[PDB]
Structures are given as C-alpha cells and as structure tokens.
C-alpha cells in the first residue's frame, strides 16, 4: 500500500492578508474524506496569521526555508526560531532557492540534516535542469542531490523526510511531466534509497511531485505507483488547490 | 541644528517570542524624553508579535530585508507583502547580506529604489572591509556603494533615506571606531551627499554609526557634529539598548 499521501501548497512570496485568509477559509470549509497530509507553506511574515486562521486538522503549516542556527544573519530567520514559533514542517532546497540564493547541493543536505535534527518534518526538494534532462542525464543529477543529502542523515531521520521532486524546466512553465515521467523518476529516486539505505526507508518515503500540477492534471499523475503526492506552486493559491487534495486517491 | 536622531535595533536572527517579549516590555516601560526615531528590526516572523506588542509611540518596526516583488520566490520576503502588512521602515544591504548572500553595490541600490518606490522609509547600508580601512580606501569604497545608491534615486526621495554607516571589521567584533574616525566617515559622506545630490539634502540627512555601539560608548560617539544615531546589533538583544536611546542627545 502506499504511504500516507502528501497535498503541498507553496505560495512562495505571494499574498496579502485579505488573500491569503480568503484562501485559508475555503481550505477550512473543505470537506477531506480520506488520509492525507495536508500542508501551507506561507511566506515568514503569514506565518502567525496561517497558525491562527487555518483551524483544518488535516493540515499543518509550513516555512519555505531556514538557515541552522541564530545569530548575525540580518534577514534570515533560523530553525531555533521556527520551532520557537511552532512550525513544525519545512520545505528546503526549493529549486528557485538552489538556482538564485547560493543553495549547492551539500548546503541544501546540511539545511535538512539541521532541520530533522531540530525535529521538524522536511520536504527537502530535488530536481534536473532542462539541459540535464536533454542530455538524458535527469537520473545521475538527482541521485547525486539525493546522496548529498542521504551523507548527512541517519538511517532513523528518514522518518522525517519527504522528497520533492520537480524537473526545474516543468516549475511555472506550464510544462507538466507526463504520467510515466513522472512514475520514473520517482521510482529511480525510490530503488535508489532502497538500495543505499534500506527498502523499509524506500517504501514508506513520500516522493512528492511538483511542477506544473494543476486541478486537472494531479489525479492522473496520482495513479502511478510511485507517486505520493504534490508540492503545488500556482495553483496553490487558488480553488483548484481543493481538487488536488481530492486528487490523492 | 542636526536632523531628528535615530536609534534603530537590528535583532538579526535572534529572539524566541518570550525573550523578545521581555525586551518589548522594557522599552514600552522606558521614558524617553526627547526628539528620537526608535526602530525595532525584527526577524520577518516575530513581525506580528511586535507590531502587537510594541506600544511606545517613538518606536516603529522594521524588516531586515526584502526582494523587490512578490512572485515564484521561495523563502524570501516582498515589499509588496510587507506594506500589506503594516511595515513601513525597512533595512536594506546590510553588511551580512552583501558578504553572505551576493548583495552587490547595484542589488542593494535596486533594492532601496524599489522600497522607496513604495513608501518606505529605508535604513541603507554601507561600510568598508577591513583590507579597505587598511589600504587607506574607507572613502572610496564608501562612496562607491552610496553613489550606486543615488544612481537609482532621485532629490526627493532622499526625504525617505537614511544612511547607516558600518565599517565591516567593527560589526560584532567589540572593534568600536574611535569619536573621531566616525566623524570623519560620516563627513566625508555628508559632503559628497552636499556635492552631488544637494545642500538640502546633505544637512537633513540621518547618517547613523554602527558597529559595536553599545550603551557605554554611545554618548561619546553622538556628541559628534555629523552622527546622528546608532544602528545597534548585539547590544539591542539587551536591556542596556535603553541607555543607547538615552544617549542621542
């Protein structure tokens, strides 16, 4: 059976509180008849209206970055600070992140292994350019992010762990990965871990898939096997985000 | 007669929402009894918390940063979303962000345009790095970055500027400058600011010293003719950023 299935919103830096709370009511009216973990991820300054407006217990909130520790980082905000505040689940190494904010692969590792050590679940996110991918180079590309990040964790911190995997190229470009794309770069990702860390690990790992997912598109692409779900750019600050999270079964 | 004094608190990454509301508690039980700006510098996620809490009315708060528009930015901040939200003072090319997070002489000047584009009052900063100071090249290097600064703006947007001036090597290192080289940094910036831009302008503008200010060496450095308050790191985490208040007269 698969895992518990996962329905991410990342509104990136998007939102004005009159939005966003438009957004979250229709989120809270929702009616979810089937196990899925549903989560926000607001920009740091929504943070403490999400916590207060969102009341929808299929949910949990979410920060879209971090950095390890406290201290004279002016503009960052850090873990500490974070699990101080009661947020509990973090997306880190966000594609836009890796390719304008400095993140290198073994910084995006020692974020998540910083981040599970804190105890927070992690949607820690991976994903090929469209150079690799014309190159047919998708599958040593993310293995490599993949690793990076497996070197600083403990088998026992997968438990916390969710991967995203979203092709660079398929981000807000309206270009989805077909169902058996997808299906296969998921299942790379997943024999991958089976093999490196363990196929207990491999089998209850959520590998979540994003870019491009819409109302539309996110049932087909949850059929396939290796599929638990959607990490939502665009479309997560609309209606249509409801219909994903239908999506998951 | 000099401008109205400001002394602003830049928290950095830092505070836990009990620490931060002790420190909140203090300043609105502290009597202040002339003509100065206070700004609390929050991390964006304590924003909430102390525009809530925060109560004296010479107070205002503050970002520590921020991109120019909202969008497909995952993890950072907008000006956009930040006026939204009530904050309208902001500190931008702080020294961390241009050593630790690629912010060039041309990314900060962007950065201060678009903020007070949009009606903020913005804390801008500058200072040179400790082979600079060395080489005998604080002037030059100083006045390059608020030459790309000014580059971007125009006469009347100076209304909404203020200058904080840190040399690099004095941030967090217990590396005061001494009175007299503070003076002469924020002269020398005054004077180009008289030649290139205006009179007007040069004798208005706030031009704060930090690095290293704390509640013991403040009154001597605001006794100088061309300081005109303090942007305060380490020291604003405690209670002795009271006396740092009390010395800007």
Same mark, same amino acid.
């Given at each position: 059976?698969?895992?518990?299935?996962? !329905?991410?919103?990342?509104?990136?830096?998007?939102?004005?509180?009159?939005?966003?709370?438009?957004?979250?009511?229709?989120?809270?009216? $929702?009616?979810?008849?089937?196990?899925?973990?549903?989560?926000?991820?607001?920009?740091?300054?929504?943070?403490?209206?999400?916590?207060?407006?969102?009341?929808?217990?299929?949910?949990?909130?979410?920060?879209?970055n971090a950095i390890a520790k406290s201290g004279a980082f $002016? +503009?960052?905000?850090?873990?500490?600070?974070?699990?101080? #505040? +009661?947020?509990?689940?973090?997306?880190?190494?966000?594609? &836009?992140?890796?390719?304008?904010?400095?993140?290198?692969?073994?910084?995006?590792?020692?974020?998540?292994?910083?981040?599970?050590?804190?105890?927070?679940?992690?949607?820690?996110?991976? +994903?090929?350019?469209?150079? &690799?991918? &014309?190159?047919?180079? $998708?599958?040593?590309?993310?293995?490599?992010?993949?690793? !990076?990040?497996?070197?600083?964790?403990?088998?026992?911190?997968?438990?916390?762990?969710?991967?995203?995997?979203?092709?660079?190229?398929?981000? +807000?470009?309206g270009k989805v990965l077909t169902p058996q794309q997808a299906? &296969?770069?998921?299942?790379?990702?997943?024999?991958?871990?089976?093999?490196?860390?363990?196929?207990?690990?491999?089998?209850?790992?959520?590998?979540?898939?994003?870019?491009?997912?819409?109302?539309?598109?996110?049932?087909?692409?949850?059929?396939?096997?290796?599929?638990?779900? #959607?990490?939502?750019?665009?479309?997560?600050?609309?209606?249509? #985000?409801?219909?994903?999270?239908?999506?998951?079964?």
């Amino acid at each position: 059976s698969k895992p518990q299935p996962i !329905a991410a919103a990342n509104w990136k830096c998007n939102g004005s509180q009159q939005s966003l709370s438009e957004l979250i009511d229709l989120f809270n009216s $929702t009616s979810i008849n089937h196990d899925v973990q549903c989560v926000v991820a607001s920009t740091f300054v929504h943070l403490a209206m999400t916590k207060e407006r969102l009341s929808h217990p299929k949910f949990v909130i979410a920060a879209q970055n971090a950095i390890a520790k406290s201290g004279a980082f $002016t +503009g960052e905000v850090s873990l500490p600070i974070l699990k101080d #505040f +009661g947020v509990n689940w973090i997306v880190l190494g966000h594609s &836009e992140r890796r390719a304008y904010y400095g993140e290198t692969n073994e910084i995006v590792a020692d974020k998540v292994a910083a981040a599970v050590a804190s105890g927070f679940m992690v949607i820690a996110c991976i +994903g090929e350019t469209l150079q &690799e991918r &014309e190159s047919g180079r $998708t599958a040593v590309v993310v293995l490599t992010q993949i690793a !990076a990040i497996a070197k600083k964790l403990k088998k026992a911190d997968w438990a916390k762990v969710v991967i995203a995997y979203e092709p660079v190229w398929a981000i +807000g470009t309206g270009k989805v990965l077909t169902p058996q794309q997808a299906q &296969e770069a998921h299942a790379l990702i997943r024999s991958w871990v089976s093999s490196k860390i363990g196929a207990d690990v491999a089998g209850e790992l959520r590998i979540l898939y994003g870019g491009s997912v819409n109302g539309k598109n996110a049932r087909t692409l949850y059929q396939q096997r290796d599929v638990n779900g #959607f990490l939502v750019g665009g479309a997560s600050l609309k209606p249509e #985000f409801v219909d994903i999270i239908k999506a998951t079964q």
